[PDB]
Scaffold this active site. Sequence first.
Site, PDB file in Angstrom:
ATOM      1  CD  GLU A  58      -2.838  -1.472   0.556  1.00 43.87           C
ATOM      2  OE1 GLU A  58      -2.981  -0.706  -0.416  1.00 43.87           O
ATOM      3  OE2 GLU A  58      -3.617  -2.417   0.782  1.00 43.87           O
ATOM      4  CD  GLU A 102      -2.956   1.968  -3.301  1.00 37.87           C
ATOM      5  OE1 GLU A 102      -3.367   1.525  -4.392  1.00 37.87           O
ATOM      6  OE2 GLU A 102      -3.128   1.346  -2.238  1.00 37.87           O
ATOM      7  CG  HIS A 116      -5.758   1.011   0.837  1.00 32.73           C
ATOM      8  ND1 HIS A 116      -5.873   0.463  -0.422  1.00 32.73           N
ATOM      9  CD2 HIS A 116      -6.959   1.571   1.116  1.00 32.73           C
ATOM     10  CE1 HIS A 116      -7.093   0.682  -0.883  1.00 32.73           C
ATOM     11  NE2 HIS A 116      -7.771   1.353   0.032  1.00 32.73           N
ATOM     12  CD  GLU A 152      -3.874  -1.927  -7.070  1.00 31.50           C
ATOM     13  OE1 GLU A 152      -3.833  -1.414  -8.213  1.00 31.50           O
ATOM     14  OE2 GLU A 152      -4.032  -1.251  -6.029  1.00 31.50           O
ATOM     15  CD  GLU A 196      -7.351  -2.537  -4.750  1.00 35.33           C
ATOM     16  OE1 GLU A 196      -6.360  -2.227  -5.461  1.00 35.33           O
ATOM     17  OE2 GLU A 196      -7.443  -2.233  -3.523  1.00 35.33           O
ATOM     18  CG  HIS A 224      -6.685   1.342  -6.633  1.00 30.61           C
ATOM     19  ND1 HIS A 224      -5.970   1.051  -5.491  1.00 30.61           N
ATOM     20  CD2 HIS A 224      -7.453   2.417  -6.331  1.00 30.61           C
ATOM     21  CE1 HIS A 224      -6.293   1.911  -4.541  1.00 30.61           C
ATOM     22  NE2 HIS A 224      -7.190   2.750  -5.025  1.00 30.61           N
TER      23      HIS A 224
HETATM   24 FE   LIG Z   1      -4.278  -0.477  -1.683  1.00 28.62          FE
HETATM   25 FE   LIG Z   2      -4.905  -0.655  -4.552  1.00 28.05          FE
END
Ligand SMILES: [Fe+3]
Ligand SMILES: [Fe+3]
Lengths: 510, 388, 388, 168
Positions: free
Chosen positions: A97, A127, A130, A192, A226, A229
């Site tokens: 992250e 991120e 995260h 990811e 997510e 991303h």
């Molecule tokens: Fe992440």
């Molecule tokens: Fe991510």
Amino acid sequence: RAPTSVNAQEVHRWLQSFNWDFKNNRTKYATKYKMANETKEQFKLIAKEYARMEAVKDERQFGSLQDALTRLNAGVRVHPKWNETMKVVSNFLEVGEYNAIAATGMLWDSAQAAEQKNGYLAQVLDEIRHTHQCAYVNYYFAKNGQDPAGHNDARRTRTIGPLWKGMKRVFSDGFISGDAVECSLNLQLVGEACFTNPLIVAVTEWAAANGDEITPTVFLSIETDELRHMANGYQTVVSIANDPASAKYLNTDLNNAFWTQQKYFTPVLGMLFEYGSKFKVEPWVKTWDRWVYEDWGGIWIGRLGKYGVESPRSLKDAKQDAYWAHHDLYLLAYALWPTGFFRLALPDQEEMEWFEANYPGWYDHYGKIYEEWRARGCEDPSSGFIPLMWFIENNHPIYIDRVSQVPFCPSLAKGASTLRVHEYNGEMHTFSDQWGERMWLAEPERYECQNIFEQYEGRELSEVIAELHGLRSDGKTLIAQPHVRGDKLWTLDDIKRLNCVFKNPVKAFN
Amino acid sequence: SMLGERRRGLTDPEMAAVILKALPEAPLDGNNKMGYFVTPRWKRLTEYEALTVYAQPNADWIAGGLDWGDWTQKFHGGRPSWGNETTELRTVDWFKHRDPLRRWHAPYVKDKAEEWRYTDRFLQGYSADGQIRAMNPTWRDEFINRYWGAFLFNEYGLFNAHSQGAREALSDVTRVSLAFWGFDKIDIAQMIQLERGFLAKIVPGFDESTAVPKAEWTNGEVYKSARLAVEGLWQEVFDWNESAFSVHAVYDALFGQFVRREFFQRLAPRFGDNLTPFFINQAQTYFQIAKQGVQDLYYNCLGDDPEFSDYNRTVMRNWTGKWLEPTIAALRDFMGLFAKLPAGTTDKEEITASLYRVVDDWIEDYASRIDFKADRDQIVKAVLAGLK
Amino acid sequence: SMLGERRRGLTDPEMAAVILKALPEAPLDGNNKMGYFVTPRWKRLTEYEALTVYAQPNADWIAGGLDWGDWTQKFHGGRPSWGNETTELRTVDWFKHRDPLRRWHAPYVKDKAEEWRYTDRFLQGYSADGQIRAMNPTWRDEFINRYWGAFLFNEYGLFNAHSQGAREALSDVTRVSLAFWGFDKIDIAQMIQLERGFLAKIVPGFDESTAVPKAEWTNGEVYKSARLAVEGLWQEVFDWNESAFSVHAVYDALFGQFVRREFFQRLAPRFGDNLTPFFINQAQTYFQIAKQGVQDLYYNCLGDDPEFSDYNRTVMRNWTGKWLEPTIAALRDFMGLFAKLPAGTTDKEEITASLYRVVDDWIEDYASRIDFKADRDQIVKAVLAGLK
Amino acid sequence: KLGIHSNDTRDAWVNKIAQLNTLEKAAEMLKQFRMDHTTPFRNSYELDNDYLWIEAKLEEKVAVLKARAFNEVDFRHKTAFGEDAKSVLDGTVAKMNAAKDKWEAEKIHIGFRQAYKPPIMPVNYFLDGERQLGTRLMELRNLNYYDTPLEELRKQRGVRVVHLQSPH
Ligand SMILES: [Fe+3]
Ligand SMILES: [Fe+3]
Ligand SMILES: [Ca+2]
Ligand SMILES: [Ca+2]
């Protein structure tokens, strides 16, 4: 005079016109592709609306944590094996992250179209959320857990062991070092899309199976971020698919990206899932096949086909090297247990029945070895025995891939056993597969990472741990343990008396 | 089903009993503080530090790092994922920085989220209270839409000036603070467009299109020397520490503070406009939020580094001087706007007092910190020499 | 101990096993919608309606009640806990009212909390950015400290005017809206004091004591009739709807909107005062929020009641004429403050226009809703007479 | 005194680096250190475990001196050697776009780092080069990345193949 306002979309309508031309409006990073400044992002977000949608998720998460969960003592009623496993999962994913922050900042720079930049920018922030979310999981477990050691200092104590080096490759250096686009394939297109996204949920499944309601609470929040991303990753290829260079490099950087990621998670995740738990959810074989083969390599990759994206060539091969990979890895992990910052356990009777059932021939190889190790006293600190000793006695060298940093022992492995050793300008290099060998041969100055044996060579185990603070509060007891019971915990002394001295295995070849 | 299928270890009788049986009778370590080994900036360790410090996997060869060894994968050529070579500045420990506001992601989005919703309600009250009625048509169609609307790109550009920094920062504490400084900037830019979008909804004939403001920025005169300074801090600078410093402690502290506060925040009232000052309030609160961190990084930490105090302080004065000039040039080109204001809107005696406020503040908050000798008079006179 | 001593049925294997065994295969009814029997005002029942409507245990003899029988305990003498006798207005159902903003307690405190925090940040950025430097001394020490401050008691009085209603309101939805209209007024009074207390901290010699603005309020001329009207609305009206209606659809709609918006909001920006307009923004937002609730209750529910529409309109017209007079007196005296301003601050035309804005807003947002035949020219002319 | 973060071989260089008090040999010593101890082309691997740390401890001393012994205009346009930052960057990029193959390009980039890496060249030009130099290297390298069989590739790299094990 009707109550009126303006929303995210409404402002985002003109965000594309925010960027303007000028001689130097160009990426500061080396790349081989050209991202069209005509590219758009899917989600029309503004800094403010983004803040709001994330603060809402936070309120739930932290509300559950600080209240209902703390009241249910959810931080304690978790299986000992999983409390340990989460020291690794959370902090290791934390670095993923954290580097993803730099990664998307790098991609934010690469983007020319104002919308693509905003898309990446939105991730930069996620991120960061995260990074702090994973940090909070360890933090919560350290404060309300049955064993804070490791959770409370993984950031420094993780440097003692070998599993960490590999993590850094796929989740740190892989995310930021190289053509920005290659870094995007590692992170988003493969990382990811193929692994991170589904493992996050998978992690919650195993967590709940083992009493962990803390992780599901936090990982499911992270989860919600997510799809943005992956969309960023998808739009990455779209922004270059129209460029000639792409047809000349996209597939090669993606294949390297695929191999790079799968090389670590194929063995590592399976091991964390099947060995760091008591209650199981599903055999790793099943999961792996599904994720990488039908979903990712099948459905997801199939979408970008029209954009000039082909299934990684090393795909078949990855499947070949996979079956016993995680089982092969744990042997090394447990054998070198004193280099970790967590407590490992040997499979119990119920588990050994599970492994054999789902992995025909597991007992005849791994099972018997583990029982051999236990009968010899690998769990008792007065036995003077450490499985690393068993590897030496039976001439089973443990090397470290110069590229992926993944520990492998070809003389014992039931999985792949290839081994390529070379020497160049006074230094030796050990490789575990044809793909990683090529990457080094082609880009030798990109992979000069000193392995654990190179650094610890000549040093006495006990003093390596001591220098890297691998001890618990009392300064006597080790953080790492060969079992997860409350008593008979090994001490630095129990280690010192073993008189283990690290040796560079490649030197055997002279 | 009402009960579901998945069994859970915390609530399922059988599984929980196995879990309970396997549990020790006391934690295997009494030290339950996840950042215990981190050196506190304050009396006690804050959640902010425990959750941020050392999240970056740097090795000791990078001031402050705790790991060891080269990176696992580097750039073609051999460039380190992160390295000392990406910034002129040197320090004893890159992890010393501390955001005075202790802002990690949570508190950060919580504050901006409150502001977003406070903002939404404000717009609904303003429109329903018909306050737009007391707003000068000229000021609206010409100074808020064109010149203010064009300043959107200034902030926007200072935002992008953070892309490299977001990728090269040598520590987590510096990386987060930095990313927040940039995010706040794009915010303001989007807020200038929000206002223009609002006006469009309550003022028929008002175009929200960036077309006009854009041309005033790209091919204008008022912000010509201004855009040049931005295109420079953004694309011509490769040292992340130089971008952050130059932008927040030079360009934006002078040009930016004067334009936002000493021109719009000061003239908007006189034209019956309480709308614009509402957003400029945010940009100013943000400015002051950043400033505390930008001071703690470049002064408390770097400028006052126990081993490179002299070094950095010198390199900064060097930058302070390298940009103080393009700044001054961008400020005098701005003066050409004062002759646009309806006759008798502001005398030079004021401009001199406001122009001196931006400089004086700059001197007490930045220049005097790195012992950079600045001459208030020469500065003021320089930008004035382009006025009306 | 680590595990604790209390055993919980959700986690204790044994107790949970006992709970799990006594459970049914599925729910004993699929109607999992609390409040499902409430007529929704919109598409689908809202959480606001479900958590609120019918919470008040009224019996069928109080329009709309679902219960039966007399109260269990009444006042000495016989007075009912709640009854029709406490208001002149009639309706087919007291539970019809809906707050357009659907504000139940959680949402309400959430928004005010954001406002509290946002306000806190504002002052810090305002003070740190040094914005008082540009505020005219006289405007600050005379018109803010004395006159704006004095207005604190006006809003405080209007707040208190809601005490009886809090106890007498015939339904939960109306009680809750009332409580919130009142609570929003006490807040404004406290913000006016928050500003003064603030100026005392950043401006040396500024005394935050309420004595001065209180003496202005209790003894001055500018607010004399305003105070007289407030003292009456608060303590001489024993009917909870006359109180709420007269306060929000007459007095605050005219006097309040004029003072806050046409005097202070309008003039402060002229004296470099962005501080007061900040708090006025909240008051105007609160005012617009309340208006919606007020219009729904008095106009949409009562004034348009299918059975008592003509009756309720007659009564509200009655109330409007009753309180319009003292409100005109309130405005008439306020006119006196203009002669106190520095020469050339504003003129008779600006005042007459701002006066006409308020009255026109009042005529379409309230008066016309009950067919009150209001004459704008006559009202403004009566007020102008107070222009000393 | 053995160590990972603190050891004799390290205390030795700070002792050595301390004797420096003239940007002259300091700048020169950094370039030498880099030629012998960094990159696959290093002259030796005896400092493998400590070169990264020492290199930085060296760069520090070179920075402090170059700052005190340089005027503002030079500090950002002139290398610690006396060279003109820009001229070098443009020369190295001129030559890089000349390279007839990955093998040549490779040596121009790596050599570039060893020589001008800050505190020698101003960071601004260094990374500016890193952008163009890295772009060329990658373009050539990533062209038909897999066509060359490992056997042949190994000869091209010129490694001393010490052992090959493969059941498949
Ligand atoms: Fe992440
Ligand atoms: Fe991510
Ligand atoms: Ca009088
Ligand atoms: Ca006039």
